[PDB]
Design a protein around this ligand. Structure first.
Ligand code: PLP
Ligand code: PLP
Lengths: 419, 418
């Protein structure tokens, strides 16, 4: 009561008139807040799509990371979801940040995060953006090419470079190795070339692919990273930074859970990078931190019946907005009823469509649903990763508002981390 | 002296919203592009940028008036919602096809009366229907019984335009899977609207974006006539024919604008002669804007893969302007910005966007001379379904658009405006 208004006051300060962070009472969840917001507009037409984002879920992910990967410092991949509230939460918690560009560096530096908690993990950077990093004290960057070394020699000669190597991402949902990652053969030449140019290489990074499905690829990558460390020693570098990238799942609704992956990572780290080697192990998790924290509520705005009886439902977010993940992230979205269905009632073959002009704007091709009506809500859980970060305003449709929530214990845990 | 007059006009035209640069004495939009590149040749300030020729848009309008004299164009704002484009076409006297509240707001903010707006989204959020009603926008499209019920409640005096299905099997972007009533449904919709005291004033269709077969317009027009006859039978006084979009936006196409218009015009005269009282409109998007925009991107990074092949990374990509590759089935064509040496050697090359994603590849395979970091590549015909669907994934910002317009182009716009 007095306690609740105290926490809310502090969450209002945290929000800083940039985002709304709503205090979660004892016994109330992010799911309850979603229901409450829906009930509040029940007799209204003000039924725009919206998210509820549980900042407490993000804190739980951090705790869980600390336990599962105790030797590995997480640097959050800003690109996955660049919402300021998320970055601010993680900044207070004490994570590092993997930044892809100048604007992400600017976001992170604006929240008071020191340059040593940033890795500029884009291997192929525009020179003007390299200069920006140099001018703002961001020293650590990745690379995987000889041209990148030539650019760094000119624009950031004192940078600490991290050589990104190829992985076997053949079974990963999102493959990155076609685009980034030097082969071991190329790595050797890059090390020698860096040495000639008087550039300091301090370590190795890799990414096994977003949505990893074969955890052994982490073992192969760690083994390969050791080979490059060894080659660096031969050419004259003191290597101390191992960056194991991302690829971790962001919810429990997956075949390969986080803990299964960390269970194979840890023994490989102990074998190839024992703590008495002096190695600092980092990672660049994105999806892991944020996926389950966001739930999206969309409203059914239009409806058609196609004759057994089948239905087409149109909702107010789509493939040009949050559901761009269907195309770019190969996401398989699962529509959830906001109103619990009657135990007995008929289900029909149904399709779900976005709000735009485009026939390509289809969210679900075929599913079974009870008969729904205009004004009913549908829910999409685990919508935090590679969603709002890649949304457009095609057709003029604005991005759903994100309403943040946080419990007392979550707030307290964040303060614990912040010292 | 003439430079000072026209640039004063154009400074005020752009205001503090956009930059509109005067094209002098036989200077083209291509020349300005080259000029801007030359200005930064000694620096590292090489962000991707657009040059957009508002005079090209004005030429499209003049061309439309000549090719389809019976058809009032309502620009499809969604194709490219840049304010400068809408302001240019607004002065010209086009109508506007608005998809949502935000687009209606944009058009009304430029002084366009609601009778020059069609809300051509068949499946509209109720609150946005109410927005249109509250702001005097009467004409809206529909294709379902639930839409009629929504209109009865939220916009009872609306003038409705029944959208029908088309054979878009061969169009680049198919729309009839999502929108357009069958003939059987159309009859039921008219009967239902009569019983709900809703006024249905006409029929619309869309043959699909990137039309490949012009005869689709003929069948759609004959289908629209069938629905007009249904309407007369139930007691409506239908007058509005809306032939949608699907026209090409450049000459770099198999099926050119005049070939399509050449089959449309006889169909219109056959099925909707001027003595019928019909008013004919269309909803072109791509047609007005595609060729007007050229994108210049910089090669920001480079790899050699062993004959030698090359991978070039540029500072716009699939999450940005080149989203058109995924959403618009665009076939983009990289162009050199400097003429190569006549003998010099070409390599198999790929072109990649600036983001983390392996999916962010613009050109899988093309032949190019050996390029270097700092060199520019050009992409013409980049005005349609590009900037309008770009995101800031990885934090990369949208390229700024530099507008240009000639003196003769300004004068043309004046000639249209009164
Ligand atoms: C270099 C880099 N680091 C981190 C990530 C985040 O990966 P994930 O979200 O799968 O953890 C990515 C995303 O593709 C990446 O390319
Ligand atoms: C209803 C409607 N009108 C107009 C257009 C613009 O089409 P285009 O750019 O092919 O002329 C579209 C695009 O899909 C549309 O759906």
């Amino acid at each position: 009561a007095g306690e609740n208004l105290y926490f809310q006051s502090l969450m209002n300060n945290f929000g800083n008139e940039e985002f709304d962070c709503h205090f979660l009472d004892e016994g109330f969840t992010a799911k309850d807040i979603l229901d409450q917001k829906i009930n509040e507009v029940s007799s209204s037409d003000d039924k725009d799509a919206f998210y509820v984002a549980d900042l407490g879920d993000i804190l739980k992910k951090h705790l869980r990371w600390l336990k599962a990967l105790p030797r590995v410092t997480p640097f959050y991949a800003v690109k996955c979801n660049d919402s300021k509230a998320i970055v601010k939460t993680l900044a207070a918690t004490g994570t590092g940040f993997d930044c892809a560009s100048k604007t992400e560096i600017q976001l992170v530096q604006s929240l008071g995060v020191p340059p040593e908690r940033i890795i500029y993990a884009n291997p192929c950077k525009q020179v003007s953006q390299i200069k920006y990093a140099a001018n703002n004290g961001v020293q650590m960057m990745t690379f995987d090419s000889e041209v990148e070394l030539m650019k760094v020699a000119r624009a950031h000669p004192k940078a600490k470079l991290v050589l990104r190597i190829a992985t076997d991402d053949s079974k990963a949902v999102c493959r990155l190795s076609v685009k980034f990652g030097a082969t071991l053969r190329t790595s050797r030449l890059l090390l020698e070339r860096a040495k000639e140019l008087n550039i300091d290489v301090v370590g190795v990074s890799f990414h096994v692919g977003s949505g990893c499905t074969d955890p052994e690829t982490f073992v192969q990558a760690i083994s390969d990273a050791r080979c490059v460390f060894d080659m660096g020693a031969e050419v004259g570098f003191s290597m101390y930074l191992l960056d194991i990238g991302g690829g971790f799942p962001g919810s429990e609704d997956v075949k390969l859970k986080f803990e299964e992956i960390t269970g194979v990572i840890n023994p490989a780290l102990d074998k190839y990078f024992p703590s008495d080697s002096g190695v600092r192990i980092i990672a660049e998790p994105g999806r892991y931190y944020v996926a389950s924290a966001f739930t999206l509520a969309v409203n059914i705005i239009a409806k058609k019946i196609v004759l057994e009886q089948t239905f087409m439902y149109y909702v107010n977010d789509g493939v040009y907005g949050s559901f761009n993940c269907i195309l770019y992230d190969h996401a398989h979205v699962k529509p959830l009823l906001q109103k619990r269905p009657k135990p007995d009632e008929k289900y029909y073959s149904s399709s779900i469509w976005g709000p735009t002009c485009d026939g390509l704007d289809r969210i679900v091709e075929r599913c079974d649903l009870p008969e729904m009506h205009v004004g009913d809500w549908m829910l999409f859980e685990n919508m935090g990763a590679y969603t709002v970060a890649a949304a457009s305003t095609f057709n003029g449709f604005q991005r759903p508002t994100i309403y943040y929530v946080m419990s007392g214990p979550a707030w307290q845990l964040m303060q614990q981390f912040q010292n």
